[PDB]
Amino acid sequence: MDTQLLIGSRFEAGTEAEEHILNPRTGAGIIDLAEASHAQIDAAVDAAERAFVGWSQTTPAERSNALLKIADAIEKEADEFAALEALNCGKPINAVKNDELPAIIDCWRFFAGAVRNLHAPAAGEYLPGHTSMIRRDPIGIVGSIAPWNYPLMMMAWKLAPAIGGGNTVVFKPSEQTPLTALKLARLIADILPEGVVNVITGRGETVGNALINHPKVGMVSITGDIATGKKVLAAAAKTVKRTHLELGGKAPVIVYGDADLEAVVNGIRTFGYYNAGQDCTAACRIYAEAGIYEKLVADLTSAVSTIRYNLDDDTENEIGPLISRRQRDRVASFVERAADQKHIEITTGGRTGSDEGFFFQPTVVAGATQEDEIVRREVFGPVVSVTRFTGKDDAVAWANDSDYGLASSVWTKDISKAMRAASRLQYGCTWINTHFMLTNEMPHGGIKQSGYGKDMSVYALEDYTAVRHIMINHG
Amino acid sequence: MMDTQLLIGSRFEAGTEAEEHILNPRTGAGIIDLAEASHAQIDAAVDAAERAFVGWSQTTPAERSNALLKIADAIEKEADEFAALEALNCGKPINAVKNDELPAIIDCWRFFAGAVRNLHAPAAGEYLPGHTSMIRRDPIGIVGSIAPWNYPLMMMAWKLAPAIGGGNTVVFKPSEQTPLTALKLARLIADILPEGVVNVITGRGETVGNALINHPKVGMVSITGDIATGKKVLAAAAKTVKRTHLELGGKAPVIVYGDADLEAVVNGIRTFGYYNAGQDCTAACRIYAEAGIYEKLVADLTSAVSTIRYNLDDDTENEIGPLISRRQRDRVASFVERAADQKHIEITTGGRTGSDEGFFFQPTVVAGATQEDEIVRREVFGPVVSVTRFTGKDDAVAWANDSDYGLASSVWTKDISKAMRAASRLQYGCTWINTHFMLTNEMPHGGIKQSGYGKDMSVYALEDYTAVRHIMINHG
Amino acid sequence: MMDTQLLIGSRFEAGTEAEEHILNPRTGAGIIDLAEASHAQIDAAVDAAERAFVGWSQTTPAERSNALLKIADAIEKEADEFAALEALNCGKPINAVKNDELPAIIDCWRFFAGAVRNLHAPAAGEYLPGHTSMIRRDPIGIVGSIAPWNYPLMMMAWKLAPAIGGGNTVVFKPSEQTPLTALKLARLIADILPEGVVNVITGRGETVGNALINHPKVGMVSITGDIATGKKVLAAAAKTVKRTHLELGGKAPVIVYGDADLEAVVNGIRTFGYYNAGQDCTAACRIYAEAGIYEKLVADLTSAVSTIRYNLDDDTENEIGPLISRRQRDRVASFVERAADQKHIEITTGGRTGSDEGFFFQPTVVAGATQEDEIVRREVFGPVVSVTRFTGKDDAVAWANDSDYGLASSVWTKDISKAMRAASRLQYGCTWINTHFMLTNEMPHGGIKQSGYGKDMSVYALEDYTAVRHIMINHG
Amino acid sequence: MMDTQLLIGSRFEAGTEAEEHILNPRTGAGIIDLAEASHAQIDAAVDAAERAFVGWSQTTPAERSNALLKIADAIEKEADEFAALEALNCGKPINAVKNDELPAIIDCWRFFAGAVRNLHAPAAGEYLPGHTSMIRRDPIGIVGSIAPWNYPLMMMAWKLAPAIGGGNTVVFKPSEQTPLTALKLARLIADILPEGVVNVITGRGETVGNALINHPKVGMVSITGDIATGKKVLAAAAKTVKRTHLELGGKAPVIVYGDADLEAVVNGIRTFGYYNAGQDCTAACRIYAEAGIYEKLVADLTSAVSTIRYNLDDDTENEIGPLISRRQRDRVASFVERAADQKHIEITTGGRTGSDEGFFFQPTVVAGATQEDEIVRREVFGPVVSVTRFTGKDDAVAWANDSDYGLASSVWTKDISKAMRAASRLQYGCTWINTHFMLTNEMPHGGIKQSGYGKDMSVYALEDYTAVRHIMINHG
Ligand SMILES: NC(=O)c1ccc[n+]([C@@H]2O[C@H](COP(=O)([O-])OP(=O)(O)OC[C@H]3O[C@@H](n4cnc5c(N)ncnc54)[C@H](O)[C@@H]3O)[C@@H](O)[C@H]2O)c1
Ligand SMILES: NC(=O)c1ccc[n+]([C@@H]2O[C@H](COP(=O)([O-])OP(=O)(O)OC[C@H]3O[C@@H](n4cnc5c(N)ncnc54)[C@H](O)[C@@H]3O)[C@@H](O)[C@H]2O)c1
Ligand SMILES: NC(=O)c1ccc[n+]([C@@H]2O[C@H](COP(=O)([O-])OP(=O)(O)OC[C@H]3O[C@@H](n4cnc5c(N)ncnc54)[C@H](O)[C@@H]3O)[C@@H](O)[C@H]2O)c1
Known part of the structure; x- marks a missing residue:
């Protein structure tokens, strides 16, 4: 069982307090799992910053191919992923195998396509003698925080559009369900350049709190309670980070x-x-x-x-x-x-x-x-x-x-x-x-205190990209 | 004389609170003293926006389009008057305002009348066997909207056109230093929109502005101004999970x-x-x-x-x-x-x-x-x-x-x-x-990092003020 | 004066060929006899479009947008004269024209004024390393547009708005029975648009229409009419690979x-x-x-x-x-x-x-x-x-x-x-x-199978009249 | 030893007409003799396409996207074989085909797998009061696709991927001189798609292509070739108002x-x-x-x-x-x-x-x-x-x-x-x-004037092979 945090170009046990990961069906402990220290969080964010330089400069095709390879890797191991999810959440095994896994693999594959399929107002001379065009570029470093209820699927929804947008990411699973995240991390590490995806574990009040307050983090994405979203907006307020909130x-x-x-x-x-x-x-x-x-x-x-x-x-x-x-x-x-x-x-x-x-x-x-x-x-x-x-x-x-x-x-x-x-x-x-x-082509996301931003659909990828106007004067 | 009154639902009325001394910045001389909206007037403006939302969120794009065209016409008909007023209040050279600012303002309202009728989304179809999906872009609700003093009337164009155009209703506050053109446009707008769709209130950021951005019924706050002001808006938004639109310099x-x-x-x-x-x-x-x-x-x-x-x-x-x-x-x-x-x-x-x-x-x-x-x-x-x-x-x-x-x-x-x-x-x-x-006006303007997010002008402005909705019909 | 002259580039001009006996279909009484274009006049018409295209194809979306609004405006100011004339020519009950057709016609011009500013495409970006790609939608060329008698002024709106809107020049021919509103509108168009952007000729399908659709300089033919006529348009397009737009039945x-x-x-x-x-x-x-x-x-x-x-x-x-x-x-x-x-x-x-x-x-x-x-x-x-x-x-x-x-x-x-x-x-x-x-006016109308292809109304009509272009800059 | 059989619905069949002498263009030596389709095999391929259309036109985008991914994967697994066979048939230097063509071919199929799930249209909503509109892009029907000899396997990808992807069924004819890669691809496709969704026939333009383009059940023709061939395709299309897609050089x-x-x-x-x-x-x-x-x-x-x-x-x-x-x-x-x-x-x-x-x-x-x-x-x-x-x-x-x-x-x-x-x-x-x-592959390739119209590659290729449909529900 994979227990190592993905911090830049290396895997690494957490150095802080252990979470007692429980089997929800029996109440018995599955595993004790140390959380990221602040040093490791900083390391992860620093690696993300380093990887951003080259990763933001990849073509849509390059990023598409990477999303397809993550999809293969998951498919090739769908069974073990399904069993590990079933164990972590007490979900019925066939519900996971039959409903969740194909949905999850389809998500990565859907995003591989949407990445090559962004639209915008057409390039042209909107002012005489000037040629305008619109690009959808990377935003920066994303801090991604996942709930416990659909761990591996939540990971697809958060990571696929983030990475696919040219962004680098520091991802944190729920303290209760880090398991499928650590296995997928080992797999992603063999496909993606180092630091593009970083995976840390720990409690929301320590590790999650550190990630959402980290000055280098440009966008925070979270699914969880209304109260948690309010914390995220509060942190966001400190350094004007973009936010993406799915609040129940x-x-x-x-x-x-x-x-x-x-x-x-x-x-x-x-x-x-x-x-x-x-x-x-x-x-x-x-x-x-x-x-x-x-x-x-x-x-x-x-x-x-x-x-x-x-x-x-x-x-x-x-x-x-x-x-x-x-x-x-x-x-x-x-x-x-x-x-x-x-x-x-x-x-x-x-x-x-x-x-x-x-x-x-x-x-x-x-x-x-x-x-x-x-x-x-x-x-x-x-x-x-x-x-x-x-x-x-x-x-x-x-x-x-x-x-x-x-x-x-x-x-x-x-x-x-x-x-x-x-x-x-x-x-x-x-x-x-x-x-x-x-x-996976259709958007899921709240209005009012349910939040804003979409999971699935081109819209999620739009959430993770910056709209940029380029204007060339040629008279 | 000058337009002095706040637009509050179906009522034009004077502010109740402290008077601001609106100054000619070329001379430092007083132009006029203008009273702030009271807390009661703020609440009444928001309630009027809530009531008007019922009917306004239900209009078609063509109806909204036609309203935007009319507002643009009204401004164009009084273009020299708006320009002189704006020149007075800000000390902008009269001709820069007449030639650069008014034509861009008018054209903004016209651009958005088009944009309203031209929103795109993923195509309708059967993405799941026997189920028909479509994507709608619907109104978000009530928008609290706050403008800076550097380009008062243009900024009002940028804040109102997409907001109203998305089928929202608005409570709009100009900067405490530059309300003049806003109270003038308010007069013209009341002759065009149904009451409560647009409400204009005056006052200081720390009083009137603060109350507006913290109103429970306001679902979206749009602010152009200081980084610190956007941080305050975000803190307010944290309380009821409001949407935010931030241009922060x-x-x-x-x-x-x-x-x-x-x-x-x-x-x-x-x-x-x-x-x-x-x-x-x-x-x-x-x-x-x-x-x-x-x-x-x-x-x-x-x-x-x-x-x-x-x-x-x-x-x-x-x-x-x-x-x-x-x-x-x-x-x-x-x-x-x-x-x-x-x-x-x-x-x-x-x-x-x-x-x-x-x-x-x-x-x-x-x-x-x-x-x-x-x-x-x-x-x-x-x-x-x-x-x-x-x-x-x-x-x-x-x-x-x-x-x-x-x-x-x-x-x-x-x-x-x-x-x-x-x-x-x-x-x-x-x-x-x-x-x-x-x-x-077709091309988006808006920042990243601490400049904020959201766009002004372009169809993206309009996308910011609408809610993406997925409708799925199981048919078999 | 009841407008009877062809608009050929910068000249208004009577046709020099056989006269069509335009009838009041309510009574069967003669209204006026209208001479059709000669081959020479058709040539001049297409030549003027060729010439006007140089500058017109280089105008901005906003410039074309404003021209469309001015055309809408002109029609609206003369709505009743247009309705009365369409009623006389077609027997259409007067209030049906007034309440149904005119508003729809006017709103078509305005819809396209927006649509011109709202074309989308795949986003600009680096699809190959070190190369920036972008997608434009540019004018196509000279359009020859042919209209039926059932809705004379509306078909003109559907045919012209997106063609002109897309940066093209046009030679438009109304049906032989119903030229009257087209010639009235040509007079208003001439006071708004640069000479030769819109040209209007009269005549029979087998003489003038056949000449127009067969002209080598004409890059695209648009026809609304009978399946047999669409087939004739297709045969003609085959000589010079013209683009076609066919609404056929x-x-x-x-x-x-x-x-x-x-x-x-x-x-x-x-x-x-x-x-x-x-x-x-x-x-x-x-x-x-x-x-x-x-x-x-x-x-x-x-x-x-x-x-x-x-x-x-x-x-x-x-x-x-x-x-x-x-x-x-x-x-x-x-x-x-x-x-x-x-x-x-x-x-x-x-x-x-x-x-x-x-x-x-x-x-x-x-x-x-x-x-x-x-x-x-x-x-x-x-x-x-x-x-x-x-x-x-x-x-x-x-x-x-x-x-x-x-x-x-x-x-x-x-x-x-x-x-x-x-x-x-x-x-x-x-x-x-x-x-x-x-x-x-936002939603497309047009056929599948032998009803043809191409849309009228909606952004899709504008797309039919523009050429998608890939521009890729090697930068390393 | 190569694949020699036409794909005609659920069956592989040798052609029954005259044999084409397929030559090695490097040596002038004969590679293989390969029989043409008869008129009866042509009709059979089209009728299989008609039958397969009923089910294929009702698949979801995901289902079709997966079909395209498996075709991409299958070609990738046999990249070297395809490369060698194309290099033999065309005399193209082997590493040009391996390093340039094969990767472009395989990526074309993956690109369209994505485009299929990613079509856009005006958003759904109430354009008239009480009427919900939405826009669909549905299949057009049976496509007859004709390819030139210069890039046989790649042209096949360009023709087939968007046509199939739009929900259409296809009868495809390679160039008479270059059928070899298409027959090899046919075996792989036949293990993946429902029978009759893709059919592959061989023969001369004057016999087999002519019979294909003139078949009354063919609703769209796509040709890449010479201007003269494109005019012939238009000539055929005039007889039943077929849609056309022309890349004419x-x-x-x-x-x-x-x-x-x-x-x-x-x-x-x-x-x-x-x-x-x-x-x-x-x-x-x-x-x-x-x-x-x-x-x-x-x-x-x-x-x-x-x-x-x-x-x-x-x-x-x-x-x-x-x-x-x-x-x-x-x-x-x-x-x-x-x-x-x-x-x-x-x-x-x-x-x-x-x-x-x-x-x-x-x-x-x-x-x-x-x-x-x-x-x-x-x-x-x-x-x-x-x-x-x-x-x-x-x-x-x-x-x-x-x-x-x-x-x-x-x-x-x-x-x-x-x-x-x-x-x-x-x-x-x-x-x-x-x-x-x-x-x-994300960027369109297609001409204007006598180079034809329609695009290869990009989402526009897919739009060319789908029909835009407006659905409007009066709910009150
Ligand atoms: N799971 C959901 O999506 C969901 C939806 C609606 C309501 N809820 C409610 O939330 C409660 C528990 O569910 P949950 O744990 O999945 O949601 P949660 O918000 O408690 O946790 C979600 C994620 O955010 C992290 N987090 C928590 N506090 C944080 C903070 N201050 N800063 C940064 N990160 C923080 C957590 O570690 C976890 O990764 C339940 O009472 C339930 O009613 C959950
Ligand atoms: N109006 C329609 O959309 C429509 C559709 C289907 C059938 N019809 C049938 O057509 C008849 C009425 O004619 P219509 O004017 O509606 O359509 P039509 O096809 O006769 O003419 C439409 C336009 O095309 C022109 N035209 C005709 N022959 C031409 C040629 N050889 N070359 C170039 N242009 C040519 C005409 O002058 C007219 O301007 C009726 O009997 C009706 O049943 C009409
Ligand atoms: N390869 C190209 O794209 C291209 C472009 C421009 C010109 N050309 C010219 O064409 C010649 C080479 O032939 P090619 O294969 O490239 O183009 P082509 O037009 O001769 O053939 C292309 C395809 O069309 C089919 N076809 C030919 N005649 C037909 C007919 N009457 N009806 C139906 N289908 C027909 C052919 O069998 C082949 O599958 C050269 O002389 C070259 O100059 C080729």
């Missing part, structure tokens, strides 16, 4: 009377509880038309109680556990304070779902109003709340009444209603009659 | 090689180092001159600069105006004096205040500045240019890049190869070759 | 599923099958109605259509006008009578000529037609709609796609699934869902 | 100013005027030299060119191969003979046949040619370059533009002003500055 979401699900309830329920069953609902796009805030409200709750309760987790065979598991005991207790806290109300009812689950490990029972919270904590605030667990609306209510207006703005869905067979909702929802993504589906 | 390097057209270089810096009394984030101010031509350039530029006309009775004969305030003049005076204390630095011309009253400073050439001098490292924002010698053993691009600024730059040489190598490698939002300072 | 299919809003469908078809007396290549003319609603759709459409007002003295009360000519009316009649003699076919309303004078035909509904019937295979170009039944077993999208035409199409269903599958699979340049006929 | 002018690096110019022409024995449409063949450096250029070029190595027994030491055929060689020789007859022209070196066996021609410099000479007006497609003198009185760009061709061009000067002025006024799809011939 409570995705609204609007269900009209003419929805296919079977599709809706099966949709929420998987997409509302996938990855134990530790997903920023998780279907969790349900608005249900009054006519189908009771049927929805009923049918959803029984379909949710069949969700398999913690089974002795990782083939039959549909959802995994929560990342930590801390994460589980927080999910349990939001559920208790919901079960607090004499108008809210927990129809299924609500309790913790194991002795050893950090499992939580799939939960349906019903009767919840716009006022309630479970609706207004993010739960980040295998929990879903349901809220009634009527034909006299503007469910889009209700959905839009939020600090969040990442992802959303609308379920109805009526093209008129679905398209009206689609044009009015204040969310980075709106699915119609599905939820949760991503494709 | 520059220190444009001008790389002059031995094979430049020296006459061109000199007439270049004479104009673009000193235009608007150097109160321009793209001023040609940090010169790197190759050893073979350093002394001739210093000698010729000094000669050229000392002929710059200012503070003449006949305003059509003036080339540059004064600095905006006593504070600004002193700051420039203090930078120059600290530079002259340096034994290796020679002030070859100017270097002192330039008038008995009002806020003129003499056009100044600072020779012999090095890469670690304050005058090379920090923005001065006065009619001041420094020159730094490099040799053929020195990488002048590397020197130019060794800066905290990233806004604008130029390279002078007849050699196409050196010119394209430098254009290729310069870490600046903009790089001119054998000119400086020329802008065009 | 539409027989718009309308797929109505059993779950459509039937009231909306009926009201849609009442408006869109008959607008401009069905002289529209996007007319909703070939209807496919599912077994469940077929009968009711036929009854309700029959009834709705029988109320369409035309040929009333008060022109403000007319909903549709006459056909352009006696020939065109006689052509429509033949198609319909031949259809009626078919055993499985029923004419449920209309089917006769509709006036004692002029060239009206009764709005007609034709039920029980099949894929094999002439009325369904061939474009009729008159106020005639046909309804064909299909069952849940049939693939109506395949039926629709079983055509040589590929211009426009609509699908009517409240089911989002059915609507999206159809949208993705229809082999048509345009697909509406739950409407038909609605255009917008 | 070049006569690349090279403008050399008095202040160019003459060493570079000489070295540029030595390589880029004679690469592939000048059987290349971008060959640096028409030189315009300033009066001050004309005599120097001619002298030094002559020197440089008489050292060009060819027909050595060690192929790694050969820099150019032979002409493809005797008819080609005799055409080149006949062009030179006629130039030599002109009294003001001097063949300074070469000008004769260059081998006893096979089809070598001597690298040739033709000095003193004017604008009026045949050798300047007409493409020669051999190892021949002509030089014309211009003075400072003359506008050399205008001279370059006085041409029926418009494919590629270069300008040589140290002066950035002169380079950029030229680059903006040259009427050529490509202009290089201070190099020639350099291509890159």
